[PDB]
Design a protein around this ligand. Structure first.
Ligand SMILES: Cc1cc2nc3c(=O)[nH]c(=O)nc-3n(C[C@H](O)[C@H](O)[C@H](O)COP(=O)(O)OP(=O)(O)OC[C@H]3O[C@@H](n4cnc5c(N)ncnc54)[C@H](O)[C@@H]3O)c2cc1C
Ligand SMILES: Cc1cc2nc3c(=O)[nH]c(=O)nc-3n(C[C@H](O)[C@H](O)[C@H](O)COP(=O)(O)OP(=O)(O)OC[C@H]3O[C@@H](n4cnc5c(N)ncnc54)[C@H](O)[C@@H]3O)c2cc1C
Ligand SMILES: N[C@@H](Cc1c[nH]c2cccc(F)c12)C(=O)O
Ligand SMILES: N[C@@H](Cc1c[nH]c2cccc(F)c12)C(=O)O
Ligand SMILES: [Mg+2]
Ligand SMILES: [Mg+2]
Lengths: 414, 413
């Protein structure tokens, strides 16, 4: 009828990888696989574009570290995707305050296990001043570091494992790379392997409902053009983020794990120009962290620039775009001049610009934790980056995927 | 403030026409006007794509008649759009039954006085057999004509308004045109002109609910990337179809009119080929109406063919499309073969192909004005469906004009 042996929902690097680690196994010879995804394209939070012709840009994930993420490096080589050196690993145009970061936080780790699980702003604020702790943090660029849920021990892990301000640790042993053609090439590689082993894709359809009926599961999905449809599958993987799980009839997260989950929004805007004006300032392949609302400002070669914000600042910029595209472009050039110490009529307007916003850009856990969850009752398997040590990286996907593969192949064998 | 004087929800031809009329009035000189649409692109049911390399295909509204659509033709001329002749006005292959039916149709006409609001199916069941009735009613290629909510009165009118079957009625004199750069070319022209007047477009935002708060209104929209959004406006038109209206919190249909509304699904599939393999059979600019699922097969010059289906037979193809692309492409050359009376293998595989399904492609009119008003809250609604041209984009064009004027009623009140 309209059915399958195994069903994976979600075609991010997680669910896509789940499928490969399953077709790989003979325990699955003959069994049919069907994969759904809301988007019409595969890759989830991995989306790569070509910016009005020209070159390839990265609206989602953009870099990896062979040191931090060893499995992602093997998936790159496995599907033979060329990497390139990621340029934005430290700071030339350091202001006054982003020179004291290293001397401070190196000697600002006496109470890492003496104060403890305190929120991270009220930790750094108990030894330097507050009107001087809001200055040291805001000069690191990530506004994730001002929040109640994230803690002081959670917040130093974010400093050391992000390329632009890891030099504020013993963490320059980390090299950083980006995909030469975009991570889209990795996703297309996996997608090809899985179609070839005979899985069947159904992109465009979004899952709304699951009932258990007997041996398997009955899913209610809504294509993106109104068409509803149902799928019965005997085994079911829900490789989607934890914000996605709440949307469903599946007791999330009580039935899966005694944990709570959070999320932060992210925003990126890209700008290309007729003449590549920013070279007169020796700003090739470099990055400026600023107090103004742009926050992080990146200059890729002589081809485009872009900026990257989070939390409240992400929600700041989704606000300007709502009131009007021109108001948006006029405000970032105001802030661009502010940042270069120049007048706003020295800053050209762009030809082409694009921009994406992620309502749940990064999903994480509070506070142990297995790499994949299961329903205590119905044995649905849930796979996501958020359930792993590396909540928030592609490595989290690859780990949760290898896991959920074996949890499901168990549910099959014997 | 995310505030505005006037706010049009919907950027189909209706909504963009309300915008055009208001911005041409001085009772709106220096009044703010924002237009929302959940889509990422204006047009609504008018969507034009380039298929393959140099084929302009019309996935939504396709053709118009200077006889039945004078306001559309004016609009196309007003905006320097050029339109070509629509070739699909004759059946070169009238079948036994679809030869014996111009005559069969004429005779029953005065039995529309006798009993005229029956099923069009029930209606023909009387003159001929229920069996002889169905083969006649099916040879016209619009399965909507089997639904019971379609009276024998409007049946005769739907037949007469369509270019492939109008010879069966005494509308055989109507001419037909299609835009050549695609009807999007018109939509773009209005968009561009309503921009230059200073309206402001927030596209990719979807109205979820609306609350009255005294003077004006408070709209809660959700961006397509998840961003929630509140917007405050003084005057509100909802240039959205009925089915869209049922979705929102505003009481509809009851706070608005007596009538209830219905809709049909529509399907359209297109295929281009390596060489134009239908020219040997003399089929360019022909249209065959068959009794198999394809239903209406069109052959456009030497550029592509397509088919066009509705009601039950639309859901049949949205179904076979979901059960994998592979057999869809294969049921089609199967059925292309029967229609031609050739063996399956003389029909080549296609290189490109695109298809579209509209869940509510036609919305209709089942004692009725051009543009609705809320009894209590007095917000304005306008769509093709509130008109004598339900299902036609002339219905949009004039519902919009009544609606626009119905609002400036509110500007001096
Ligand atoms: C701006 C940004 C930058 C990033 N930079 C980096 C980086 O440099 N390095 C790094 O390692 N990681 C980075 N990441 C994170 C990385 O992209 C993610 O961790 C990873 O892609 C998540 O993969 P996933 O397979 O768990 O699911 P996702 O990639 O989140 O995809 C989930 C899929 O499930 C689908 N889905 C959801 N819900 C439903 C439903 N009800 N029915 C059907 N389908 C559904 C979604 O469409 C999606 O396709 C970044 C993320 C963002 C937003
Ligand atoms: C396959 C097909 C063929 C057709 N052929 C013809 C033809 O040959 N001749 C002819 O005259 N007509 C034809 N039509 C119909 C014609 O397109 C419509 O009658 C006309 O476009 C009506 O458009 P509209 O302005 O009423 O709004 P629509 O085009 O119906 O759409 C209005 C807009 O409002 C948006 N919208 C809706 N709801 C909400 C919400 N809750 N929040 C925000 N935004 C929203 C919609 O997304 C849409 O963009 C055809 C239609 C179809 C489907
Ligand atoms: N996309 C980021 C990862 C990131 C950005 N902000 C936060 C906050 C908390 C945890 C995180 F993993 C992140 C990057 O790849 O640079
Ligand atoms: N504009 C459509 C009309 C259409 C097609 N099927 C039906 C059924 C009922 C009413 C209708 F107005 C229609 C067209 O020309 O295709
Ligand atoms: Mg995934
Ligand atoms: Mg409209």
């Amino acid at each position: 009828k309209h059915s399958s042996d195994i069903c994976i929902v979600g075609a991010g690097i997680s669910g896509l990888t789940c499928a490969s680690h399953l077709l790989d196994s003979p325990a699955c010879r003959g069994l049919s696989l069907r994969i759904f995804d809301m988007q019409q394209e595969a890759g989830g939070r991995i989306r790569s574009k070509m910016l009005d012709g020209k070159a390839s840009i990265e609206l989602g994930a953009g870099r990896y570290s062979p040191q931090l993420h060893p499995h992602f490096q093997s998936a790159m080589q496995h599907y033979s995707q060329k990497s390139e050196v990621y340029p934005f690993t430290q700071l030339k145009f350091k202001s006054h305050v982003q020179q004291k970061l290293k001397r401070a936080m190196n000697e600002l780790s006496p109470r890492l296990k003496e104060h403890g699980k305190e929120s991270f702003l009220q930790f750094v604020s108990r030894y330097q001043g507050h009107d001087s702790a809001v200055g040291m943090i805001r000069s690191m660029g990530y506004d994730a570091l001002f929040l109640p849920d994230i803690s002081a021990e959670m917040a130093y892990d974010i400093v050391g494992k992000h390329p632009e301000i890891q030099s504020v640790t013993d963490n320059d042993a980390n090299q950083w790379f980006a995909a030469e053609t975009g991570f889209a090439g990795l996703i297309q590689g996996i997608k090809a392997k899985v179609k070839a082993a005979g899985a069947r894709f159904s992109l465009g359809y979004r899952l709304l409902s699951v009932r258990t009926d007997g041996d398997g599961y009955l899913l209610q999905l809504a294509g993106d053009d109104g068409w509803k449809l149902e799928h019965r599958t005997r085994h079911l993987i829900l490789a989607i983020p934890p914000s996605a799980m709440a949307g469903l009839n599946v007791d999330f997260p009580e039935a899966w794990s005694g944990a709570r989950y959070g999320s932060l929004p992210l925003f990126k805007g890209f700008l290309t120009y007729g003449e590549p004006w920013w070279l007169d300032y020796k700003l090739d392949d470099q990055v400026l962290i600023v107090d103004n609302p742009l926050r992080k400002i990146y200059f890729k070669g002589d081809k485009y620039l872009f900026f990257y914000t989070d939390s409240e600042m992400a929600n700041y910029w989704r606000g300007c775009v709502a009131e009007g595209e021109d108001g948006y472009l006029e405000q970032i050039r105001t802030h661009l001049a502010s940042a270069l110490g120049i007048v706003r009529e020295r800053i050209p307007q762009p030809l082409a610009h694009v921009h994406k916003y992620w309502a749940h850009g990064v999903e994480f856990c509070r506070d142990d934790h297995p790499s994949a969850l299961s329903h205590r009752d119905s044995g649905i398997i849930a796979c996501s980056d958020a359930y792993t040590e590396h909540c928030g990286w592609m490595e989290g996907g690859l780990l949760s995927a290898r896991e959920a593969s074996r949890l499901l192949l168990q549910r099959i064998a014997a």
